[PDB]
Amino acid sequence: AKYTKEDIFRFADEQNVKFIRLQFTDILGIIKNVEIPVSQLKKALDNKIMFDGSSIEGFVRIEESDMYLFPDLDTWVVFPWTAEKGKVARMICDIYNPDMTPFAGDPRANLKRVLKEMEELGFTEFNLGPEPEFFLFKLDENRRPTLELNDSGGYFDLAPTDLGENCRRDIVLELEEMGFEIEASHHEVAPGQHEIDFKYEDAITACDSIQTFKLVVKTIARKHGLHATFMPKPLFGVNGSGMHFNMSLFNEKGNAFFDESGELELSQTAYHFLAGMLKHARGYTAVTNPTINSFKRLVPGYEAPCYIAWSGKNRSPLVRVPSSRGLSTRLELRSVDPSANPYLAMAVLLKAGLSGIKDELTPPAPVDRNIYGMNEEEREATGIYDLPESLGHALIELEKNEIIKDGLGEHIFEHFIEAKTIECDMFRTAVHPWEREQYLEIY
Amino acid sequence: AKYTKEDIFRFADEQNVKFIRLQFTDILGIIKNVEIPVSQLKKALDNKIMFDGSSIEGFVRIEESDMYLFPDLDTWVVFPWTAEKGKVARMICDIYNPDMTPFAGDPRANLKRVLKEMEELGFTEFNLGPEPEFFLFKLDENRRPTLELNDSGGYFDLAPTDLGENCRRDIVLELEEMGFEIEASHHEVAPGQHEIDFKYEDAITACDSIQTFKLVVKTIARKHGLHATFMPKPLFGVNGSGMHFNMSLFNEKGNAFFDESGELELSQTAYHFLAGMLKHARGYTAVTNPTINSFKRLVPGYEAPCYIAWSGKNRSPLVRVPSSRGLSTRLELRSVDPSANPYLAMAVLLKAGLSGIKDELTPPAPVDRNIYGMNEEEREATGIYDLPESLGHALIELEKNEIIKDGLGEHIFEHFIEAKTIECDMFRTAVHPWEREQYLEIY
Numbered sequence: 081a082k083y084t085k086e087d088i089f090r091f092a093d094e095q096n097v098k099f100i101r102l103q104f105t106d107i108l109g110i111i112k113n114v115e116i117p118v119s120q121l122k123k124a125l126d127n128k129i130m131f132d133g134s135s136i137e138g139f140v141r142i143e144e145s146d147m148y149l150f151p152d153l154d155t156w157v158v159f160p161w162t163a164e165k166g167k168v169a170r171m172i173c174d175i176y177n178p179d180m181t182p183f184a185g186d187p188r189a190n191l192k193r194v195l196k197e198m199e200e201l202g203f204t205e206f207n208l209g210p211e212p213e214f215f216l217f218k219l220d221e222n223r224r225p226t227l228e229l230n231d232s233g234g235y236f237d238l239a240p241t242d243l244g245e246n247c248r249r250d251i252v253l254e255l256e257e258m259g260f261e262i263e264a265s266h267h268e269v270a271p272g273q274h275e276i277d278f279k280y281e282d283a284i285t286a287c288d289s290i291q292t293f294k295l296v297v298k299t300i301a302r303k304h305g306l307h308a309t310f311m312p313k314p315l316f317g318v319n320g321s322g323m324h325f326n327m328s329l330f331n332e333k334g335n336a337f338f339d340e341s342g343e344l345e346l347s348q349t350a351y352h353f354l355a356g357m358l359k360h361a362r363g364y365t366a367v368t369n370p371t372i373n374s375f376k377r378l379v380p381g382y383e384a385p386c387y388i389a390w391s392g393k394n395r396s397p398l399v400r401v402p403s404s405r406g407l408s409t410r411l412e413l414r415s416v417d418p419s420a421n422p423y424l425a426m427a428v429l430l431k432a433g434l435s436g437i438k439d440e441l442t443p444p445a446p447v448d449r450n451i452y453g454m455n456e457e458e459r460e461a462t463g464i465y466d467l468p469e470s471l472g473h474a475l476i477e478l479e480k481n482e483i484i485k486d487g488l489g490e491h492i493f494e495h496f497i498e499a500k501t502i503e504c505d506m507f508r509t510a511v512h513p514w515e516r517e518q519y520l521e522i523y
Numbered sequence: 524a525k526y527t528k529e530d531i532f533r534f535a536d537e538q539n540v541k542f543i544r545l546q547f548t549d550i551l552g553i554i555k556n557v558e559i560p561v562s563q564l565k566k567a568l569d570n571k572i573m574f575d576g577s578s579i580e581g582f583v584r585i586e587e588s589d590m591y592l593f594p595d596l597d598t599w600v601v602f603p604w605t606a607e608k609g610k611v612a613r614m615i616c617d618i619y620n621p622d623m624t625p626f627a628g629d630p631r632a633n634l635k636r637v638l639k640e641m642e643e644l645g646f647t648e649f650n651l652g653p654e655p656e657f658f659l660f661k662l663d664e665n666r667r668p669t670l671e672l673n674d675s676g677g678y679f680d681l682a683p684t685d686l687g688e689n690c691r692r693d694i695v696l697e698l699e700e701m702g703f704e705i706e707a708s709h710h711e712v713a714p715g716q717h718e719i720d721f722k723y724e725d726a727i728t729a730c731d732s733i734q735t736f737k738l739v740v741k742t743i744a745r746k747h748g749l750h751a752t753f754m755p756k757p758l759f760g761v762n763g764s765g766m767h768f769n770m771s772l773f774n775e776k777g778n779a780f781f782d783e784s785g786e787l788e789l790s791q792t793a794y795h796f797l798a799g800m801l802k803h804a805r806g807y808t809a810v811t812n813p814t815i816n817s818f819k820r821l822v823p824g825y826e827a828p829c830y831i832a833w834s835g836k837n838r839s840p841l842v843r844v845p846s847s848r849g850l851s852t853r854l855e856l857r858s859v860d861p862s863a864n865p866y867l868a869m870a871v872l873l874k875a876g877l878s879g880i881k882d883e884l885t886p887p888a889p890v891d892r893n894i895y896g897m898n899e900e901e902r903e904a905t906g907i908y909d910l911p912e913s914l915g916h917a918l919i920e921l922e923k924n925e926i927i928k929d930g931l932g933e934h935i936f937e938h939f940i941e942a943k944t945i946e947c948d949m950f951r952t953a954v955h956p957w958e959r960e961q962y963l964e965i966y
């Protein structure tokens with residue numbers, strides 16, 4: 081109980097907020113909210129706010145249903161970019177049915193249910209540290225994004241320098257002032273691409289931090305006349321954007337992935353988690369990469385994980401184990417992209433990893449032979465397998481796998497399948513300028 | 524120990540810095556950094572910051588490797604152009620392997636190793652005073668550099684005058700406020716070309732000053748709506764940019780290059796250093812001039828050193844001995860250009876000079892006959908030789924010479940050659956508008 085009702089009332093009185101955003105996330109990952117005056121703060125705290133519940137279902141909404149908007153007190157945050165005409169505050173809200181039951185279609189409720197399963201299994205918390213990457217594009221005269229980048233930087237380069245602008249520095253400073261924990265920020269290898277690293281907190285707080293980070297990055301960029309994009313592959317021939325998850329499992333004693341007497345300073349729980357992640361990776365590749373453009377990033381190379389393997393020496397595997405040990409022991413999954421929904425992503429990941437622990441699966445031997453060059457026979461000889469190359473194959477894998485369905489729940493599963501199938505069908509029937517430019521003259 | 528941890532913490536508290544740049548330099552000389560909030564200052568001081576170590580390898584990075592970022596306390600500098608939303612500070616950081624060993628590929632660690640060799644040989648310090656030259660170009664409407672210069676000045680001319688602008692004066696003032704020692708500044712013979720001279724400090728501090736000077740010049744030129752360029756030969760028919768090194772060797776008694784009883788008021792150590800520099804000049808010409816455009820500056824003339832000779836009267840040799848003596852006795856090398864990496868440059872220079880002392884080589888007799896006009900037979904009769912005329916020949920000379928390889932280390936040597944051969948091959952296969960404009964109609 082970080083905050084209480086009286087604390088929220090006192091904060092609203094003493095920083096004098098007049099606008100409150102009760103925000104939530106739908107299946108597609110879009111940040112949605114209802115906006116109320118500060119005079120209705122009491123009704124929000126009393127959990128009596130109605131809203132059109134079909135909104136969270138996305139564009140496939142059919143039947144309107146009124147449902148509650150139970151908020152969370154620990155997520156009270158006041159934005160500074162509010163001028164003098166009243167402050168603005170946001171609160172992450174749970175979705176509840178009118179019968180005082182959490183909605184099955186709420187990703188946050190699904191993540192809470194999966195975490196409850198973890199806790200009743202014997203663990204305490206599921207820490208996550210994400211490393212999102214975003215692109216910045218110069219706006220046009222009509223406040224429209226262009227295809228030109230703000231600077232021609234490089235990997236870890238000091239590209240934006242100083243003396244005003246430097247949107248990454250301003251974003252980091254605003255996030256720090258607002259009350260977030262930032263480890264480090266740098267320039268990614270692609271021009272105009274930046275990465276900001278976060279500390280390690282709980283899974284739900286990790287989702288809240290990710291969503292708030294997306295909102296803050298978009299807002300600050302817009303103010304500085306730029307456009308912030310989290311689409312994985314904005315341009316061809318340019319490196320994509322990733323959201324690598326550094327995740328660790330904790331118990332009553334402490335870190336469950338650390339053991340000085342084990343191989344690689346890893347506990348058997350860590351190996352079971354690795355086996356569970358590797359076995360079902362093809363299953364949840366769709367959840368971790370929910371967009372068509374996401375699979376354009378997953379191409380064979382030296383930085384895009386398109387194989388199913390784990391390593392700790394050669395790096396660039398599907399799952400990488402950082403050299404740090406002790407309380408910082410963790411397993412990194414590099415196939416996640418910023419367009420993914422964090423709630424569903426760690427829901428399916430936790431389920432897969434925990435199933436690997438329940439089944440006590442033995443992970444395959446790590447590969448440190450730089451798996452990009454070996455022949456197809458060599459890859460087939462080892463347990464190396466490729467991730468799905470398109471959204472349709474990933475959807476088929478989702479429809480085949482059953483554990484990921486349980487981790488996602490029913491309602492979320494069918495809604496995700498319907499939306500993704502509609503999107504794939506729309507992409508399939510479209511005619512692109514590539515086909516015209518390479519067949520109009522030839523044929 | 525100029526500063527300690529507590530001093531750094533007190534400074535961060537009392538000038539209220541909120542952004543810290545842990546900056547370093549790769550093989551190619553590009554300034555790179557990782558950016559952290561002030562809340563992580565403790566972790567930086569604890570030498571526990573990870574970063575992608577393949578970044579310093581340049582564009583030839585293959586395998587990702589995490590490695591430490593051990594900072595240096597004596598390089599704590601706070602930038603003034605930070606507005607009111609928190610200050611910005613930088614710290615030069617050493618690159619360390621995860622096993623508490625300095626990385627072999629770090630130029631700074633290589634320079635430290637060479638300096639350790641010097642100290643164990645019997646010397647104390649290797650003072651350097653550089654004289655970099657830079658160009659200023661007017662930006663376009665889209666903040667893009669143009670081919671027009673800010674003013675049509677001359678050699679030592681009072682071209683930028685006063686009443687605002689005058690980017691050189693502002694650069695000098697900001698550098699002085701920041702805590703750098705500046706001897707003098709003036710206008711170079713080319714229009715829009717300026718030179719700023721530095722005092723004489725240690726080699727590592729000289730590198731830090733050079734890198735900070737480049738960063739500050741670029742930032743200030745950008746803020747005044749100009750572009751600062753350190754490319755040696757921006758335009759054809761216009762004098763190039765040089766970074767002459769005024770270097771001296773010190774011992775316990777004092778200056779090792781000064782002797783009142785010796786010829787030209789020079790000690791035998793100075794003559795051995797001169798012989799070592801002259802013998803291996805063709806070897807390290809590639810390191811001192813690493814770009815393709817650099818050798819366009821090294822053309823026969825009256826100001827570009829393309830010969831291997833030393834003098835103190837006629838001036839414009841490869842190596843010039845200034846008339847000043849005593850504690851200011853020094854040897855000037857005029858073949859260095861601003862695009863070179865200072866760490867590698869003085870690493871190879873110190874090695875060559877010290878090898879000349881170890882071998883007690885006798886330098887050739889100085890030439891004061893204005894070596895531009897004598898016939899090729901006359902040049903061949905004397906020990907006058909030409910520097911490599913292209914990057915490829917310089918790379919071949921590097922591959923032949925072994926002492927320079929030892930001075931550079933292994934990892935740096937193979938990475939440098941690899942990247943430079945890729946740059947050379949890319950230049951060789953390109954088709955330039957010169958070929959079109961002089962063959963499209965003729966043939």
Ligand SMILES: [Mg+2]
Binds near residue numbers: 211213268275322
């Ligand atoms: Mg990254």
Ligand SMILES: [Mg+2]
Binds near residue numbers: 211324412414
């Ligand atoms: Mg990562």
Ligand SMILES: [Mg+2]
Binds near residue numbers: 654656711718
């Ligand atoms: Mg000069």
Ligand SMILES: [Mg+2]
Binds near residue numbers: 654767855857
């Ligand atoms: Mg000079």
